């Protein structure tokens, strides 16, 4: 496998370490996403080992709601990842267009993620980053997972406090996402870092008017301070509000 076996098209996204391009395999005309990473930049951050780790993991994961890694190769100055192309773009963009999602769309997305994360947890893969910009949309509008300054909200209390940490972190993330989907902003975001940390640490947030009793119930359960009191992914799937609203 090599670069000349691919027709490179338009860029789809610009990361720190490198770009991702829309492309077709020359022989078959199989549409795909080609992620290019510059080796020198990877070596400057000291993440070449964490990159090899993601790649090993993603290649062994096959779920319809996890972005598939078909392969990889490298030349002198670059690393190439042959990836599934999600034709409909990022959830981030969808959310910026619609402002917030209704309950049917949200429950359906959360269902897809609960399944995605169950698969992961079952393969001892934990903490997959599920903030909107890391969620793509496949051919059927189905969502796909694809894993200081950032959004602290998504980090659970036990991680920001450097306590012991579990699979239960994905449940917290899921509750944050569910809120962001319905409301259009995440629940703990503040004017400063200190205020955000405080809000997370104490789970201080409020619901806007329009959020229904069922949505509040689910989000409240996912955003429990004690990781042990957070529900299981199965209990999320079987939640009245999810089953009532999901496709
Ligand atoms: C530039 C905005 N945009 C669009 O208008 C459409 C809908 C064409 C679109 C599809 C897309 N797919 C994917 C991306 C993307 C972006 C956009 C972002 C890069 C990561 C990636 C991977 C790893 N796979 N697919 C995708």
Coordinates of C-alpha atoms and ligand atoms in Angstrom, one line a residue:
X1 CA 0.0 0.0 0.0
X2 CA 1.2 3.5 -0.9
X3 CA 0.2 7.1 -1.8
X4 CA 0.0 6.5 -5.6
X5 CA -2.8 4.0 -5.1
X6 CA -5.1 6.9 -4.1
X7 CA -6.8 9.9 -5.8
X8 CA -6.5 12.7 -3.2
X9 CA -9.4 15.1 -3.2
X10 CA -10.7 18.0 -1.1
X11 CA -9.5 18.4 2.5
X12 CA -12.3 17.7 5.1
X13 CA -10.6 18.8 8.3
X14 CA -7.4 20.4 9.6
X15 CA -5.9 18.9 12.8
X16 CA -2.8 20.0 14.8
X17 CA -0.7 16.9 13.6
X18 CA -2.2 16.7 10.1
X19 CA -5.0 17.0 7.7
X20 CA -7.7 14.6 6.5
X21 CA -8.6 14.4 2.8
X22 CA -11.5 13.0 0.9
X23 CA -10.2 10.4 -1.5
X24 CA -10.9 7.4 -3.7
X25 CA -8.8 4.2 -4.2
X26 CA -7.6 4.4 -7.8
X27 CA -8.4 0.7 -8.7
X28 CA -11.8 0.3 -7.2
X29 CA -13.0 3.9 -6.8
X30 CA -13.8 3.1 -3.2
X31 CA -14.5 6.4 -1.4
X32 CA -12.5 6.9 1.8
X33 CA -10.9 9.4 4.2
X34 CA -7.1 9.6 4.1
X35 CA -5.6 11.1 7.3
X36 CA -2.0 12.4 6.8
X37 CA 0.1 13.0 9.9
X38 CA 3.6 14.6 9.7
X39 CA 6.2 12.5 11.5
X40 CA 8.3 15.5 12.6
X41 CA 5.3 17.1 14.4
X42 CA 4.3 13.8 16.1
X43 CA 7.9 13.5 17.4
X44 CA 7.9 17.1 18.6
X45 CA 4.9 16.4 20.9
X46 CA 6.0 13.0 22.0
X47 CA 2.9 11.2 21.0
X48 CA 4.2 8.7 18.4
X49 CA 3.5 6.0 21.0
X50 CA -0.1 7.2 21.8
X51 CA -0.6 7.3 18.0
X52 CA 0.5 3.6 17.6
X53 CA -1.8 2.8 20.5
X54 CA -4.9 4.4 18.9
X55 CA -4.1 2.7 15.6
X56 CA -3.7 -0.8 17.2
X57 CA -7.0 -0.3 19.0
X58 CA -9.1 1.1 16.2
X59 CA -8.0 -1.6 13.8
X60 CA -9.4 -4.3 16.1
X61 CA -12.7 -2.5 16.6
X62 CA -15.6 -3.4 14.2
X63 CA -18.9 -1.7 15.1
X64 CA -21.3 0.2 12.8
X65 CA -21.1 3.2 15.1
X66 CA -17.3 3.4 15.4
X67 CA -15.3 4.8 12.5
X68 CA -13.5 2.0 10.8
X69 CA -9.7 2.0 10.2
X70 CA -9.1 0.0 7.0
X71 CA -5.3 0.4 7.1
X72 CA -2.2 2.5 7.2
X73 CA 1.2 3.1 5.7
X74 CA 4.1 5.5 6.0
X75 CA 6.7 7.2 3.8
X76 CA 9.8 9.1 4.9
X77 CA 8.1 12.3 6.2
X78 CA 4.5 11.2 6.8
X79 CA 2.1 8.6 8.2
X80 CA -1.2 7.8 6.4
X81 CA -4.4 6.4 7.8
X82 CA -6.9 4.8 5.5
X83 CA -10.2 5.6 7.2
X84 CA -14.0 5.2 6.6
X85 CA -15.5 8.3 5.2
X86 CA -18.6 9.5 6.9
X87 CA -20.5 11.2 4.1
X88 CA -22.6 13.5 6.1
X89 CA -19.9 15.3 8.2
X90 CA -19.6 16.1 11.9
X91 CA -22.3 16.3 14.6
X92 CA -20.6 19.5 15.6
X93 CA -21.6 21.2 12.3
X94 CA -25.1 19.7 12.4
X95 CA -25.5 21.1 15.9
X96 CA -24.2 24.6 14.8
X97 CA -26.8 24.5 12.0
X98 CA -29.8 23.4 14.0
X99 CA -28.6 25.1 17.2
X100 CA -30.0 22.3 19.4
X101 CA -31.5 18.8 18.6
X102 CA -35.0 17.7 19.4
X103 CA -35.7 14.7 21.6
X104 CA -36.1 12.0 18.9
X105 CA -32.7 12.9 17.3
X106 CA -31.0 13.1 20.6
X107 CA -32.4 9.8 22.0
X108 CA -31.4 8.1 18.7
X109 CA -27.9 9.5 18.8
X110 CA -27.5 8.5 22.5
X111 CA -28.7 5.0 21.7
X112 CA -26.1 4.7 19.0
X113 CA -23.4 5.9 21.4
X114 CA -24.5 3.6 24.2
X115 CA -24.1 0.7 21.8
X116 CA -20.8 2.0 20.6
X117 CA -19.5 2.4 24.1
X118 CA -20.8 -1.0 25.2
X119 CA -18.8 -2.6 22.4
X120 CA -15.8 -0.6 23.5
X121 CA -16.2 -1.4 27.2
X122 CA -16.5 -5.0 26.3
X123 CA -13.1 -4.8 24.5
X124 CA -11.6 -3.0 27.5
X125 CA -11.5 0.2 25.6
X126 CA -12.5 3.2 27.8
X127 CA -12.6 7.0 27.8
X128 CA -13.2 7.4 24.0
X129 CA -13.7 11.1 23.4
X130 CA -17.3 11.8 22.4
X131 CA -17.6 15.6 22.2
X132 CA -19.5 16.7 19.1
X133 CA -16.5 17.5 17.0
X134 CA -15.3 13.9 17.3
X135 CA -18.6 12.4 16.2
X136 CA -19.1 11.8 12.4
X137 CA -22.3 10.9 10.5
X138 CA -22.5 7.9 8.2
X139 CA -24.6 7.2 5.2
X140 CA -27.8 6.7 7.2
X141 CA -27.4 9.7 9.5
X142 CA -26.0 7.2 12.0
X143 CA -23.3 8.5 14.3
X144 CA -19.7 7.2 14.5
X145 CA -17.0 7.6 17.2
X146 CA -13.6 8.7 16.0
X147 CA -10.9 9.2 18.7
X148 CA -5.1 23.6 29.1
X149 CA -7.7 25.2 26.7
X150 CA -10.3 22.6 25.8
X151 CA -13.8 22.0 27.2
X152 CA -13.4 20.6 30.7
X153 CA -17.1 19.7 30.9
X154 CA -16.6 16.3 29.4
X155 CA -14.1 15.3 32.0
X156 CA -15.6 13.7 35.0
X157 CA -14.9 14.8 38.6
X158 CA -12.6 11.9 39.3
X159 CA -10.3 12.7 36.4
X160 CA -9.9 16.5 37.0
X161 CA -9.2 15.6 40.6
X162 CA -6.6 12.9 39.7
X163 CA -8.5 10.2 41.5
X164 CA -8.8 6.6 40.3
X165 CA -10.8 6.4 37.1
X166 CA -13.0 3.8 35.4
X167 CA -15.1 2.9 32.4
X168 CA -17.7 5.0 34.3
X169 CA -16.1 8.0 32.7
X170 CA -17.9 7.4 29.4
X171 CA -21.3 7.5 31.3
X172 CA -20.5 11.0 32.6
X173 CA -19.4 12.1 29.0
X174 CA -22.6 10.7 27.7
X175 CA -24.7 12.8 30.1
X176 CA -22.8 16.0 29.2
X177 CA -23.4 15.2 25.5
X178 CA -27.1 14.6 26.0
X179 CA -27.4 18.0 27.7
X180 CA -25.4 19.7 24.9
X181 CA -27.5 18.0 22.3
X182 CA -30.8 19.2 23.8
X183 CA -29.6 22.7 25.0
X184 CA -27.0 23.7 22.5
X185 CA -24.2 24.2 25.1
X186 CA -22.6 21.9 27.7
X187 CA -23.9 22.2 31.3
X188 CA -20.8 23.3 33.3
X189 CA -19.1 25.8 31.0
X190 CA -18.1 29.0 32.8
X191 CA -16.3 32.3 32.3
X192 CA -13.1 31.0 33.9
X193 CA -11.3 27.7 34.4
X194 CA -11.7 27.8 38.2
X195 CA -15.5 28.3 37.9
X196 CA -15.8 25.4 35.5
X197 CA -13.8 23.1 37.7
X198 CA -16.0 24.1 40.7
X199 CA -19.2 23.5 38.7
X200 CA -18.0 20.0 37.6
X201 CA -16.6 19.1 41.0
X202 CA -20.0 20.0 42.7
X203 CA -22.2 19.0 39.7
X204 CA -23.7 22.5 39.8
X205 CA -25.8 23.0 36.7
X206 CA -29.4 24.0 35.8
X207 CA -31.8 22.9 33.1
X208 CA -33.4 25.4 30.8
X209 CA -37.2 25.6 30.7
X210 CA -37.8 23.4 27.7
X211 CA -36.0 20.2 28.9
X212 CA -38.6 17.5 29.7
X213 CA -38.9 15.5 32.9
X214 CA -37.5 12.3 31.1
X215 CA -34.4 14.1 29.7
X216 CA -33.7 15.6 33.1
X217 CA -34.0 12.2 34.7
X218 CA -31.5 10.5 32.4
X219 CA -29.0 13.4 32.4
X220 CA -29.2 13.7 36.2
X221 CA -28.4 9.9 36.5
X222 CA -25.4 10.1 34.2
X223 CA -24.0 13.2 35.9
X224 CA -23.7 11.6 39.3
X225 CA -20.5 12.6 41.2
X226 CA -19.9 9.0 42.4
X227 CA -19.1 6.9 39.4
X228 CA -20.7 3.8 41.0
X229 CA -24.1 5.6 41.0
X230 CA -24.0 6.3 37.3
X231 CA -26.1 3.8 35.4
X232 CA -24.8 1.1 33.1
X233 CA -25.0 1.5 29.3
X234 CA -27.8 -1.1 29.3
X235 CA -29.9 1.0 31.7
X236 CA -29.4 4.0 29.4
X237 CA -30.8 2.0 26.5
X238 CA -33.7 0.8 28.6
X239 CA -34.5 4.3 29.9
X240 CA -38.2 5.3 29.3
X241 CA -37.1 8.6 27.7
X242 CA -34.7 6.8 25.4
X243 CA -37.1 4.0 24.4
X244 CA -40.0 6.5 24.0
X245 CA -38.0 8.8 21.7
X246 CA -35.4 6.6 19.9
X247 CA -35.9 5.4 16.2
Ligands
LIG1 C1 -16.0 20.1 5.3 C2 -17.4 19.9 5.8 N1 -17.9 18.6 5.3 C3 -18.9 18.4 4.5 O1 -19.5 19.4 4.0 C4 -19.3 17.0 4.1 C5 -20.7 16.7 4.5 C6 -18.9 16.7 2.7 C7 -18.3 16.3 5.0 C8 -18.0 14.9 5.2 C9 -17.0 14.6 6.1 N2 -16.5 13.4 6.4 C10 -15.6 13.5 7.3 C11 -15.2 14.9 7.6 C12 -16.2 15.6 6.8 C13 -16.4 17.0 6.6 C14 -17.4 17.4 5.7 C15 -14.2 15.5 8.5 C16 -12.8 14.8 8.5 C17 -12.9 13.5 9.4 C18 -13.6 12.4 8.7 C19 -13.2 11.0 8.7 C20 -12.0 10.3 9.5 N3 -14.1 10.3 8.0 N4 -15.1 11.1 7.4 C21 -14.8 12.4 7.9

